[PDB]
């Protein structure tokens, strides 16, 4: 039967290895928000699918020569039909793949410890005692690199100084850096919500710096893009996306 | 070729400019959507003629499947773009091609200040306080179509007594909230506009759903993808945020 290849990436709570006492195979290896979304999308549109982790473990960014990696590259090269992941819809990516409409909203915000006077990005940009950074090569880092807003230009100049020592390789490294040192992590708000539900010592600082979403990636010209968009809108209007987020985000309270 | 842009009078998106003499053409209008059009035209390089939608409607279908409003202007190729607070919904996205969203919103509650009402559940539980929505808009449709028990209950109340709880437009609803014991179900962007200016009113609770306004194009339009990319660029450059601040900022309230 026609089976779509879905590229994705391990990222809590979107895609995680399921825990079992024996080896797992196929789609049963995984669970998480994105698996539930795939199940709902397939139920509406009637397609079969095979989840496959992106081989290089990357979301998708450009090098100096305009060459892409990650899930974006898998779509460009027609090695996957869909990308289902917290793949941020951005200008540079939308030019080379097709995105569905967003299934989740988010903005860049600040993850930091509780109990401090810091209240906004302006509070970080004006000083240098508190170190701050972002995940290297993600859409958050790219936002600061490209911004012409004075405050975010200043922050990029700090972040990019000293061989980019303020950046981190992944979100888990950044979270541990926040917990151990005087460091603030610039992180997508949905991930902050997940983290602060589980670490009562951490909080979001200020509001959202920008406004964007995660969408399902398809190769340019894909006939599934518009169908997936429609299904996402249906799931939103029925309240199902809200229930899915609550299912996977809610912690044990603080 | 010069593009025909369908739109609708709605504060602060599209308003008649103020002048001492008769105005002509695009110079008749000002507002957020006119600023957005100018920025889209600068990026993509098109000329445009703004034309108010002749029947003064956003877009809904009747029992026989015929559409009206700005949606119908696109369907019949009498407009190339629709630039308005036109909510992206399942039923509309099936018949036109929306750009990606340029502004986020959700359904929420406009009510007077100083009361113990705190959520839609508080309204659904009782009958002393009347509540409704604008007739034939996406908000009314959300409640009509919901299967969530609370929203089914509220729709039962809203549609009773020949729909006396509904209003013809937002200004009528705002005046009803101010004068009587009435709560208006309203898109959060409009609530923010109103409460910035009228300190007797407030938003009750949070957002009931999550959606956005998109630029409409006819199915198959080659402009939809280009407009999406331009919107993403404008968001990442902070220009969409500046445009919202320009038109929404009021004095605020204690
Ligand atoms: C720059 O302005 C922006 C950026 C990002 C989203 C947005 O507005 C939304 C918000 C949500 C949303 C949609 C559009 S949708 O109608 O495109 N798909 C369904 N959802 C809900 C599942 C999330 C506006
Ligand atoms: C978890 C990672 C590295 C991803 C998820 N969304 C962003 C993206 O799609 O680029 C990255 C986060 C960020 O850059 O803050
Ligand atoms: C102002 C009006 C009637 C419009 C604006 N967006 C919705 C739409 O596009 O249907 C309507 C508001 C609402 O239904 O609360
Ligand atoms: Cl399957
Ligand atoms: Cl690597
Ligand atoms: Cl490439
Ligand atoms: Cl300092
Ligand atoms: Cl915010
Ligand atoms: Cl023009
Ligand atoms: Cl789209
Ligand atoms: Cl209050």
Tab-separated table of C-alpha atoms in Angstrom, chain A residues 135-235:
chain	number	residue	atom	x	y	z
A	135	UNK	CA	21.214	26.596	20.305
A	136	UNK	CA	23.831	26.808	17.563
A	137	UNK	CA	22.461	26.888	13.977
A	138	UNK	CA	18.766	26.770	14.988
A	139	UNK	CA	16.142	29.299	13.914
A	140	UNK	CA	16.540	31.230	17.162
A	141	UNK	CA	20.230	31.848	16.520
A	142	UNK	CA	19.424	32.826	12.934
A	143	UNK	CA	16.817	35.332	14.107
A	144	UNK	CA	19.416	37.198	16.151
A	145	UNK	CA	22.062	36.938	13.433
A	146	UNK	CA	19.755	38.589	10.892
A	147	UNK	CA	17.916	41.103	13.086
A	148	UNK	CA	18.414	44.833	12.551
A	149	UNK	CA	16.574	45.746	15.766
A	150	UNK	CA	19.088	47.534	17.988
A	151	UNK	CA	18.464	45.408	21.088
A	152	UNK	CA	18.760	42.130	19.177
A	153	UNK	CA	21.813	43.328	17.245
A	154	UNK	CA	23.526	43.994	20.577
A	155	UNK	CA	22.549	40.525	21.799
A	156	UNK	CA	23.885	38.871	18.656
A	157	UNK	CA	27.182	40.740	19.024
A	158	UNK	CA	27.482	39.319	22.530
A	159	UNK	CA	26.316	35.828	21.566
A	160	UNK	CA	28.695	35.617	18.614
A	161	UNK	CA	31.749	36.967	20.461
A	162	UNK	CA	34.525	34.814	21.940
A	163	UNK	CA	34.189	32.077	19.313
A	164	UNK	CA	30.451	31.820	20.120
A	165	UNK	CA	31.163	30.369	23.582
A	166	UNK	CA	27.712	31.636	24.683
A	167	UNK	CA	25.920	29.236	22.324
A	168	UNK	CA	25.105	25.620	23.152
A	169	UNK	CA	24.916	22.455	21.080
A	170	UNK	CA	21.335	21.504	22.072
A	171	UNK	CA	18.498	22.438	24.400
A	172	UNK	CA	19.470	19.915	27.077
A	173	UNK	CA	22.954	21.431	27.310
A	174	UNK	CA	21.398	24.899	27.499
A	175	UNK	CA	18.994	23.873	30.264
A	176	UNK	CA	21.843	22.408	32.328
A	177	UNK	CA	23.832	25.602	31.773
A	178	UNK	CA	20.883	27.644	33.110
A	179	UNK	CA	20.621	25.410	36.195
A	180	UNK	CA	24.337	25.480	37.028
A	181	UNK	CA	25.722	28.878	35.997
A	182	UNK	CA	24.513	32.468	35.622
A	183	UNK	CA	23.178	31.862	32.117
A	184	UNK	CA	19.925	32.617	30.300
A	185	UNK	CA	18.813	30.563	27.288
A	186	UNK	CA	16.940	32.060	24.334
A	187	UNK	CA	14.469	29.274	23.538
A	188	UNK	CA	11.171	28.727	21.737
A	189	UNK	CA	8.308	29.370	24.141
A	190	UNK	CA	6.723	25.934	23.690
A	191	UNK	CA	9.934	24.300	24.892
A	192	UNK	CA	10.130	26.745	27.824
A	193	UNK	CA	6.594	25.795	28.822
A	194	UNK	CA	7.575	22.117	28.773
A	195	UNK	CA	10.727	22.732	30.820
A	196	UNK	CA	9.154	24.989	33.460
A	197	UNK	CA	6.329	22.492	33.988
A	198	UNK	CA	9.039	20.054	35.103
A	199	UNK	CA	11.720	22.245	36.740
A	200	UNK	CA	10.068	24.442	39.368
A	201	UNK	CA	13.318	26.413	39.722
A	202	UNK	CA	13.059	27.782	36.168
A	203	UNK	CA	10.753	30.316	34.552
A	204	UNK	CA	10.118	32.255	31.377
A	205	UNK	CA	11.478	35.829	31.439
A	206	UNK	CA	9.331	38.399	29.666
A	207	UNK	CA	7.028	37.765	26.745
A	208	UNK	CA	7.476	36.477	23.209
A	209	UNK	CA	10.026	38.287	21.043
A	210	UNK	CA	8.490	37.193	17.738
A	211	UNK	CA	5.505	35.230	16.459
A	212	UNK	CA	5.688	32.043	14.423
A	213	UNK	CA	4.662	28.424	14.241
A	214	UNK	CA	5.625	24.862	13.516
A	215	UNK	CA	4.335	23.406	10.258
A	216	UNK	CA	4.482	20.107	8.444
A	217	UNK	CA	7.204	20.200	5.794
A	218	UNK	CA	6.693	18.806	2.310
A	219	UNK	CA	8.772	19.019	-0.873
A	220	UNK	CA	7.869	21.933	-3.109
A	221	UNK	CA	4.875	21.044	-5.277
A	222	UNK	CA	3.676	18.272	-2.973
A	223	UNK	CA	-0.060	17.524	-3.386
A	224	UNK	CA	-0.209	16.706	0.337
A	225	UNK	CA	0.623	20.224	1.558
A	226	UNK	CA	-2.875	21.674	1.039
A	227	UNK	CA	-4.587	18.520	2.312
A	228	UNK	CA	-2.473	18.566	5.481
A	229	UNK	CA	-3.277	22.258	5.979
A	230	UNK	CA	-7.009	21.550	5.777
A	231	UNK	CA	-6.714	18.634	8.205
A	232	UNK	CA	-4.744	20.787	10.662
A	233	UNK	CA	-7.464	23.458	10.532
A	234	UNK	CA	-10.106	20.798	11.197
A	235	UNK	CA	-8.151	19.436	14.159
